[PDB]
Structure formats: C-alpha cells, structure tokens
Amino acid sequence: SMSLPDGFYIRRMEEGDLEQVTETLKVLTTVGTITPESFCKLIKYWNEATVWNKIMQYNPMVIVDKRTETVAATGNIIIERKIIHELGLCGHIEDIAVNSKYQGQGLGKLLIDQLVTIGFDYGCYKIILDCDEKNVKFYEKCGFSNAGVEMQIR
Amino acid sequence: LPDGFYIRRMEEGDLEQVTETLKVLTTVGTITPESFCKLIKYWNEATVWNDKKIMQYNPMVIVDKRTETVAATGNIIIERKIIHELGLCGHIEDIAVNSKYQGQGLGKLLIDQLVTIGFDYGCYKIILDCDEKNVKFYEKCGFSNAGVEMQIRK
Ligand SMILES: CC(=O)SCCNC(=O)CCNC(=O)[C@H](O)C(C)(C)COP(=O)(O)OP(=O)(O)OC[C@H]1O[C@@H](n2cnc3c(N)ncnc32)[C@H](O)[C@@H]1OP(=O)(O)O
Ligand SMILES: CC(=O)SCCNC(=O)CCNC(=O)[C@H](O)C(C)(C)COP(=O)(O)OP(=O)(O)OC[C@H]1O[C@@H](n2cnc3c(N)ncnc32)[C@H](O)[C@@H]1OP(=O)(O)O
C-alpha cells in the first residue's frame, strides 16, 4: 500500500498473515496456538470497529520485505475518543515487534514513524506508548519523550 | 461502597459534573450536550469481538447520594490483541476524584471496581499510565511498576 526505502513496503494486516505475524511477534510475547478461523474473525473485527466522529479504531500494520514477501515488522496504533481535550482523540501505539532477522537496520524507526503519521492524520492530539526502560532510547530516536510511569496488575 | 455513595456507568446527564471532576486531571474545555449524548451512545454500543457481551468503553462515576453529585470518575477500555492467544488487555484511563472528595478512599474504590470489570471480562492484565506523583496510590491499589510511558504531541 505504501513503499518504504530499501525494498520494504507497509500495509494493513490481512487474514493470510497469521503465520508470518506469529513469527514476528515472538520477539515480544508468546502468541500461542491461534486457529485460522479465529484470526479471520479478529481481522474482521479490526476492519469494522470505527471511532465515533472514517476513523478505524485499530490500525494493525505489517512491514513486508519485498525480496522474499516476508513480514519483517508489525505494530498497531489504536485510536481512543476521550472526554478531556474537548472530546479529543488519543493514539496508543502497541505491540511493536521487528522479526529477529530484521533488527538493527532502521525498521523499528520506520514503523513507529508510519504509525505516528497515521495517528496524527486521524487528528490525534498526542500518541502514547509504554516500553521497558531498555527501549526508552529507541523511542527518543523516534521523537518521543518521557511522559510518566506504566503500572500494571494481573 | 461506603455510606452515602454509589457507583454506576456514566450517563448523558453527567456532562456538567464530569467536566468539573476531570479538571483536577487536565483541561476538559467546552463540550456541547448534543455531542456528549452522541459520545455516550457510542460508548453504550461499542462491543469487543469474542456470546460474551464485552463493552469496549466502561466509563464509571462514583456519586455522593446527598446531592447526587459526581465525586469521582474513571474508565477502563478493553483491547483485543493477537498476543496471549488473542488476549484481552484492559487500559484504565482518566481517573479523577474532585478535590473536596480526595483522601477518603474513593479513588481506591473506583480503581478496584474498574479492575473487577476488566478481569471479569477475561483480561490477562490491566495497565495504566500515571505521573510519578501517583505511583504510591496505585501501589496501594495493588499495581506495580511495569515500564515507562512515552509520548509525542502533534
Ligand atoms: C510499544 C512497545 O510495543 S514496546 C516493545 C517493543 N518491542 C520489543 O522490545 C521486541 C524486541 N525488539 C524489537 O522488536 C526491536 O529491536 C525494536 C522495536 C525494540 C527496535 O527496532 P529496530 O529495528 O531494531 O531498531 P532501529 O534499527 O529502527 O533503530 C533506530 C535507532 O534506535 C537505536 N536503538 C534501537 N534499539 C535501541 C535500544 N534498545 N536502546 C537504545 N538505542 C536503540 C538504534 O541504534 C538506532 O540508532 P541510530 O539511528 O543512531 O543508528
Ligand atoms: C490513569 C490516571 O488517569 S492517573 C491520573 C490520576 N489522577 C490525578 O492525578 C488527578 C488528581 N488526583 C486525584 O484525582 C486523586 O487524588 C487520586 C485519583 C490520585 C487518588 O484518589 P484519592 O481518593 O485521593 O485516594 P484514596 O483516598 O482512595 O487513597 C487510597 C490509598 O492511597 C493512599 N494515597 C493516596 N494518595 C497518595 C499519595 N499522593 N501518596 C501516597 N499515598 C497516597 C491513601 O493514603 C490510601 O491509603 P490506604 O489504602 O493505606 O488508606
């Protein structure tokens, strides 16, 4: 859908990407066994959910290496409508993963820059994400700044 | 809940009092009643794919029964991911207790209720971002440090 430098392109995730997306996401978190039919239903949900305003709530993107037609990186930006900032739109970048054979050559930065473009084009006033301390420097190279602390419960 | 308070989902008539409550957190600005009614309709209809009826947005208010005044508000947004076997992640957002009602246990009660809503829906974790000043409050609510929040502004 959109070409990137050095033989890559970016496009929305599709139903046929399950295996390649699973392989890429391993570097982040365990995906586990997912049935093709369930994934098809997830993609349908991600391709229909819209934000009250067309704004897609979910924007699951894959960067594909043209040399082998393999998914090299994936990331998502989710759009949230809030009450604050006069019903503002806030973007949330999530599930960033560069396939282990494709790290250290600029793809992470290219992916984040693309997600940021998507969010600001929908009208988000800010885009946020959470990362471990060891990744802060990567996000600073992408134009982000420290905004707070991520807390969790399980 | 303690004597004299109750919790319920936010409603269209809550605009004026929710605007006042959220000012302790950030700038709300002016919102028209027509637009707020449309936002509450969006929040009362948007469901997450999974029957299990999962609302994407779960805006709650704690109300002082003496005068039916909103004393606190918070929301938990439910996200469907691919990782963790098409897992659900809860995102707590926009937590605010009016100044006059702070330090009486209402913030912890609100968080506890949002956490219950998220785990009852099947979330594998619930996360939130906060400024350093709020960390000890969230630790008293059972949360632990998970990472760093980063942001980029338009
Ligand atoms: C919102 C989240 O989802 S956070 C979770 C992110 N994901 C993960 O940690 C999974 C495992 N790691 C990865 O998938 C990748 O290595 C990523 C996403 C962290 C980074 O992507 P990469 O493609 O490897 O990095 P990329 O080559 O674009 O790096 C761009 C710049 O950041 C730097 N950089 C990359 N990672 C780091 C790091 N951890 N610490 C410091 N600097 C870094 C690079 O040196 C480069 O600097 P330069 O421009 O001066 O040469
Ligand atoms: C995801 C987010 O939206 S983060 C934004 C959070 N909101 C804001 O910062 C706006 C301004 N502040 C507020 O709205 C409120 O003061 C809140 C939400 C931070 C806290 O709510 P409150 O009702 O004041 O706190 P509550 O009385 O429930 O306190 C619960 C526990 O935490 C403790 N606590 C509260 N604030 C603090 C603090 N600043 N430092 C240390 N401990 C604290 C209390 O003493 C209490 O302890 P206990 O359970 O041992 O008795």
Experimental method: X-ray
Q: Which residues of chain A does B151 touch, with a Cβ-Cβ cutoff of 8 Å?
A: 126-129, 144-145, 147
Q: Which residues of chain B does A38 touch, with a Cβ-Cβ cutoff of 8 Å?
A: 86
b/e per residue A130-142 (b: at least 16 CB within 10 A):
bbeeebbeebeeb
Q: What is the CATH number of the domain that holds A117?
A: 3.40.630.30
Q: Select from A3, A66, A146, A18 the least CA-distant residue to B147.
A: A146
User: A67, exposed or middle or buried, with CB in 10 Å at 0-12, 13-18, 19+?
Assistant: exposed
Tell whether the torsion through CA atoms of A142, A143, A149 and B1 is positive or negative: negative
Q: How many domains does chain A have?
A: 1
How far apart (Å, rounded) are the C-alpha atoms in residues B26 and A68? 48
- Closest-CA distance of chain A to residue B146, Å: 5
Q: Select from A52, A123, A80 the least CA-distant residue to B41.
A: A52
Structure tokens at A126: 């800010």
Structure tokens at B76: 């938990």
**Structural resolution in Å:** 1.3
- Closest-CA distance of chain A to residue B64, Å: 21
- Closest-CA distance of chain A to residue B112, Å: 11
How far apart (Å, rounded) are the C-alpha atoms in residues B129 and A90? 13
- Minimum-distance ligand 1 atom for the alpha carbon of A96: 3
Q: Select from A146, A93, A77, A81 the least CA-distant residue to B94.
A: A81
Q: Which residues of chain B does A39 touch, with a Cβ-Cβ cutoff of 8 Å?
A: 82, 86
Structure tokens at B59: 């805006």
Range of the domain at B56: 1-154
Contact A87, B39 (CB under 8 A): yes
Cβ distance A87 to B153 less than 8 Å, yes or no, reads no
**Residue type, position B11, single letter:** E
Mutate to test the interface with A, among B49, B130, B150 (most CBs of A within 10 A): B150
Give the largest CA-CA distance in chain A.
Answer: 46
Q: Select from B125, B126, B123, B121 the least CA-distant residue to B53.
A: B121
How far apart (Å, rounded) are the C-alpha atoms in residues A128 and A134? 17
Residues within 6 Å of ligand 1 by CB: A 27-28, 93-98, 103-109, 129-131, 134-135, 137-138, 141
Q: Select from A129, A122, A125, A116 the least CA-distant residue to A52.
A: A122
HEC secondary structure over chain B: CCCCEEEEECCHHHHHHHHHHHCCCCCCCCCCHHHHHHHHHHHHHCECCCCCCCECEEEEEEEECCCCEEEEEEEEEEEECCHHHHCEEEEEEEEEECHHHCCCCHHHHHHHHHHHHHHHCCCCEEEEEECHHHHHHHHHCCCEEEEEEEEEEC
Residues within 6 Å of ligand 2 by CB: B 24-25, 92-97, 102-108, 128, 130, 134, 136-137, 140
HEC secondary structure over chain A: CEEECCCEEEEECCHHHHHHHHHHHCCCCCCCCCCHHHHHHHHHHHCCCECCCCCECEEEEEEEECCCCEEEEEEEEEEEECCHHHHCEEEEEEEEEECCCCCCCCHHHHHHHHHHHHHHHHCCCEEEEEECHHHHHHHHHCCCEEEEEEEEEC
